[PDB]
Write a protein that binds this ligand. Sequence first.
Ligand SMILES: *Cc1ccc(-n2ccnc2)cc1Br
Ligand SMILES: *Cc1ccc(-n2ccnc2)cc1Br
Ligand SMILES: [Ca+2]
Ligand SMILES: [Ca+2]
Ligand SMILES: [Ca+2]
Ligand SMILES: [Ca+2]
Ligand SMILES: [Cl-]
Ligand SMILES: [Cl-]
Lengths: 7, 7, 228, 228
Amino acid sequence: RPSSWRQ
Amino acid sequence: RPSSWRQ
Amino acid sequence: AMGSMERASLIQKAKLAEQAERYEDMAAFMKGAVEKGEELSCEERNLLSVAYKNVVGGQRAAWRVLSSIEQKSNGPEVREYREKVETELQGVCDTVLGLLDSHLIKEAGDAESRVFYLKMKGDYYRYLAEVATGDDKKRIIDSARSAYQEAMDISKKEMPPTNPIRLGLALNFSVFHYEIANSPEEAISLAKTTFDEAMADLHTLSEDSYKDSTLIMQLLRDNLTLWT
Amino acid sequence: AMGSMERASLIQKAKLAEQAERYEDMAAFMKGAVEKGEELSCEERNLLSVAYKNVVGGQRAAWRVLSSIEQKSNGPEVREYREKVETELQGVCDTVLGLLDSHLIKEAGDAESRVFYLKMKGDYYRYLAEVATGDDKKRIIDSARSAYQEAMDISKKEMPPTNPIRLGLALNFSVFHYEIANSPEEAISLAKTTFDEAMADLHTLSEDSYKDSTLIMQLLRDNLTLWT
Ligand SMILES: *Cc1ccc(-n2ccnc2)cc1Br
Ligand SMILES: *Cc1ccc(-n2ccnc2)cc1Br
Ligand SMILES: [Ca+2]
Ligand SMILES: [Ca+2]
Ligand SMILES: [Ca+2]
Ligand SMILES: [Ca+2]
Ligand SMILES: [Cl-]
Ligand SMILES: [Cl-]
């Protein structure tokens, strides 16, 4: 559930 | 652009 | 490719693929289930429809993006890639129409099943018509018209005006008239008469059936608002 | 399958597929472009990354849905279909890692290109590690760790602390620590130090570079807020 890199 | 049947 | 899976396992996996939003898998599982040769239940017909509508819906959305780019341009790449997506969309439509012809429609004796499949036949000829430009375009359009028309005749004799499949059929046939047949007045008349006749039948329904019917009734109203 | 298309046509079609949200097509076009054997530009590297991140992202989302259903259940169908999706995800990861090993990384001499590819190598070993359960799981985890670590060493020597690839690398390595390596304190420390060192370098940036950097800085802050 954490954020990895994304556009 | 009109709506056909959709869920 | 699904000939060695049990029918019930194909159905169970189609429902899993829906939860996973894996609609290509869903369609392949449901195609395998159809090819077992047994008739489809109400729930199974809905699974078949949902799977292929999602697959072809993504292809139609892509085709429309590429077609718009192509028309603004008028190298070969944009046309080539539009043609690639177009060919894949036509392949999926042919697959569905083949399942309907071999042999879903001929074994559908009940009004609910027969109308459901004839509506699908109209829809997938409509999708073929959206991209058609050659010698067979008028025949493709008339194949959509003929399937929708037989479904409407059966549904008006055999189903209440609030039946969700009858409502969805009339909705889609009205979109056919507006978008494909260049008959906007026919489209508007069909949508209004369908809405009004369902309105007058709502009083017969349970609360759950009422929710199902009014949901599709709102789509008819949305189109009438866009068209008038 | 793309050996007969021109490199520039593959690149042009990859951009068209992105606009059409046809990410499987996008990935196949970019794979074909890589297999031409020439190094990739900055923009082309981004196209490669976007394509495969979207493909594998859909597979990961499906795998997580099916894995959750499977664990709640504990017939063979749920396990079988989870294994099918798992195998397809592993195939895509192996494809990307194969492009990196043959021969993107060895020809990447500049820091920007080399760090970009080592970050990808870490990411796709991380995705393999998310589903790994057998003899090679610790080696898969260490392959992700080693690739991320080499990328961090290069990026800290050769790039400013606000560089978007350096920031994204540190973000993803911190997720690796938290999610994969069971090292939440390492994850938190890396995210905080990365955020603070970028904050102190913002004053050197143009308005456009500032927007790029702060965008990824917010993702670091989102994780720290979730983790502390
Ligand atoms: C075409 C169509 C119309 C209506 C429904 N529906 C609504 C609620 N239950 C079923 C399904 C379809 Br495929
Ligand atoms: C992994 C990563 C990090 C940052 C960026 N980026 C942001 C703005 N331009 C490039 C791309 C990637 Br693939
Ligand atoms: Ca059987
Ligand atoms: Ca029958
Ligand atoms: Ca050439
Ligand atoms: Ca080089
Ligand atoms: Cl093409
Ligand atoms: Cl399976």
